[PDB]
Design a protein around this ligand. Structure first.
Ligand SMILES: Nc1nc2c(ncn2[C@@H]2O[C@H](COP(=O)(O)OP(=O)(O)O)[C@@H](O)[C@H]2O)c(=O)[nH]1
Lengths: 488, 67
């Protein structure tokens, strides 16, 4: 949401930074935590329940004086939110080497067609073999939309323009794809409302014909009070075990999702805040709440870095210490940046300034602009990529700039800008190599001295940018965050 | 926007580098004054070697007198 967390985060800061904390401060700070929940479309009775749940969870009346009050008061509300969002039932996860079939249900316009592509692309990126099934025969041009999205996501799909019965086409698609031993088979179902009994029974017919391993209900975040009535009715007929929340960018912020969880006792697997297929984020329970309290996930980021799994770390270190920074290494670093995933999630997980800093309006196309860097650098040959310094060689023969511009677009100014960026990065790497022993390997210098670390910190603080270093936390804050990444 | 993208890149690069390269790093200990205290202690040691030397009676084994 990136907005409720700020309000809730400011409520916890109001409770803290006070010469004293009595029974009046708690209530005062609890009012700010209630108003924020009310703005999140949550029922007033549930809010009055969380307020009473945290009141009994932290009694200052007979609280053993001498124990951290704030620490156990901020943790009392963190457990409340987590509980408020955790159903308590373990989710379903497909097994390797077995055909797992997932059936999607939801209302019209919920985004099931896009959800199929998002889930399929996520599993394909993770390494799963997946295929698409289009069992929509009521929405006009639904198969065309699914086909174009699938060929955009290079994911196999099945369907037919002329077939009108969704049961037969879905069953035959599953039967066809089970022959070639496909692991994940997701079937796209047309929109449906509980008021219409014909499609209501068609849903049971397709469910019995396919027998999905798990049923996923797609719920938009912009709907209001009408969510519970349809969700309970849908669960009463089919075995819904998980749900996916879409349109997180909406103003309604999915306030009915908490009541849906309290009703169905099922968790949300993923959330999507963008129309684009690549916008797909997990809904891990503990990290989501930890983000709301300025306690960003550290395990998730290190897990992502481990997924990056750099092949070697010794030859790179000795290259850096000698002050060599080539173009091919820069291209590999950019490739790792692209493979790192969405850019917003990288800095969202840090305990730093906040998660509502990466705006979708401009940085989404800024990533595509950065994509042009590899296009420009792909015109470089092996001699240029492996050269010790590209600026020196590029300053001797201008015709190589023309050759590079041949493969790429104009690039007359773009090549010069890329060379300036490479020169700045090369000087940064030269200084990092001149720090004289801040890297692993070689000698057994496991512990780093404070003097060399101070010199490196001074060098780092002088070249990043203004207005972001001051809010980072200063030298002490930056070093503490780096230590957090070390231990975490 | 370019500055913001540069900031993001720098932060990600730093995180990656620390995770895959730097070793144990002290949080903060009022970073040592040793950078200039080296010359300060050089002057201090020049003072230390300038410690006063106590006077002494010079030995001289003379012979005999005369009669
Ligand atoms: N804002 C936003 N819109 C979304 C998202 N996912 C899907 N949509 C919208 O949902 C529409 C597609 O819905 P559709 O798949 O046809 O729903 P269906 O007819 O029930 O299958 C698209 O026009 C998107 O604009 C999202 O994450 N955010």
């Amino acid at each position: 949401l990136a907005d409720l967390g700020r309000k809730i985060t400011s409520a916890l800061r109001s409770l803290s930074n006070a010469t004293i904390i009595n029974e009046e401060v708690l209530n005062a700070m609890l009012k700010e935590v209630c108003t924020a929940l009310l703005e999140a479309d949550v029922n007033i009775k549930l809010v009055k329940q969380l307020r009473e749940n945290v009141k009994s969870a932290i009694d200052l009346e007979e609280m053993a004086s001498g124990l951290n009050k704030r620490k156990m008061i901020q943790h009392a509300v963190f457990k409340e939110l987590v509980k408020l969002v955790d159903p308590g039932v373990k989710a379903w996860t497909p097994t390797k080497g077995k055909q797992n079939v997932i059936m999607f249900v939801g209302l019209q316009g919920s985004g099931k067609t896009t959800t199929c592509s998002k889930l399929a692309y996520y599993y394909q990126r993770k390494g799963w073999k997946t295929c698409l099934i289009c069992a929509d025969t009521f929405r006009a041009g639904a198969f065309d939309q699914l086909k174009q999205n699938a060929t955009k996501a290079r994911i196999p799909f099945y369907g037919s323009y002329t077939e009108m019965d969704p049961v037969i086409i879905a069953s035959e698609g599953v039967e066809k794809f089970k022959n070639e031993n496909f692991e994940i088979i997701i079937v796209d179902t047309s929109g449906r409302h509980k008021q219409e009994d014909s499609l209501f029974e068609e849903m049971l017919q397709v469910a019995n014909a396919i027998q999905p391993d798990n049923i996923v209900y797609v719920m938009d975040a912009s709907i209001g009070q009408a969510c519970e009535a349809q969700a309970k009715a849908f669960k009463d007929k089919v075995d819904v075990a998980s749900v996916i929340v879409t349109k997180l960018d909406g103003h309604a912020k999915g306030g009915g999702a908490l009541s849906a969880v309290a009703a169905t006792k099922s968790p949300i697997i993923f959330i999507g805040t963008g129309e684009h297929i690549d916008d797909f984020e997990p809904f891990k329970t503990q990290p989501f709440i930890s983000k709301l309290l300025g306690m960003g996930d550290i395990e998730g980021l290190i897990d992502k870095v481990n997924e990056l799994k750099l092949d070697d770390n010794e030859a790179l270190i000795e290259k850096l210490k000698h002050g060599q920074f080539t173009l091919r290494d820069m291209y590999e670093q950019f490739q790792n940046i692209m493979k790192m995933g969405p850019f917003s999630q990288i800095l969202g997980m840090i305990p730093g300034f906040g998660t509502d800093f990466m705006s979708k309006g401009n940085e989404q196309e800024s990533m595509a602009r950065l994509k042009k860097l590899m296009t420009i650098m792909d015109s470089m040959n092996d001699q240029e990529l492996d050269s010790t310094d590209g600026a020196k060689v590029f300053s001797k023969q201008p015709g190589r700039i023309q050759r590079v511009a041949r493969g790429s677009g104009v690039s007359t100014r773009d090549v010069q800008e890329l060379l300036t960026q490479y020169t700045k990065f090369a000087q940064m790497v030269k200084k990092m190599g001149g720090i004289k022993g801040l890297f692993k390997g070689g000698d057994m210098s496991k512990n780093v001295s404070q003097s060399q670390m101070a010199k490196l910190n001074q060098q780092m603080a002088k070249m990043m940018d203004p207005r972001v270093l001051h809010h980072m936390g200063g030298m002490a804050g930056l070093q503490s965050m780096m230590r957090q990444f070390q231990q975490g | 926007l370019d500055k913001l993208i540069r900031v993001g890149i720098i932060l990600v690069l730093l995180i990656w580098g620390t995770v895959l390269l730097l070793k144990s790093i002290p949080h903060h200990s009022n970073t040592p004054d040793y950078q200039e205290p080296n010359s300060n202690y050089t002057n201090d040691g020049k003072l230390k070697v300038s410690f006063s030397v106590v006077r002494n009676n010079t030995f001289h084994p003379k012979y005999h007198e005369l009669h």
